[PDB]
Design a protein around this nucleic acid. Structure first.
Length: 46
RNA sequence: ACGAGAACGCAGCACCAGCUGUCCAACCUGAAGAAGA
């Protein structure tokens, strides 16, 4: 109850519809599956 | 009054005929809108 100060926009393709782009899931799976090491962030085949 | 005088090395004739500037090759590689607004 503090009034709409500002509004955020989910990324949506040209047909209105929302979607989660590529490389966003890649960052998410980097923070997920990169639990092993902290060196392979550019050249890793995963 | 010259081993002399006179006498076009000249006439005709396509540097031309055939021939892919072609063949192979990804504008490609690596990269979160979070965060105490």
């Amino acid at each position: 109850s503090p009034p709409m100060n500002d509004l955020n926009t989910f990324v949506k393709d040209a047909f209105g519809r929302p979607y989660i782009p590529g490389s966003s899931l890649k960052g998410a799976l980097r923070t997920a599956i990169l639990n092993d090491l902290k060196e392979d962030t550019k050249e890793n085949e995963v």
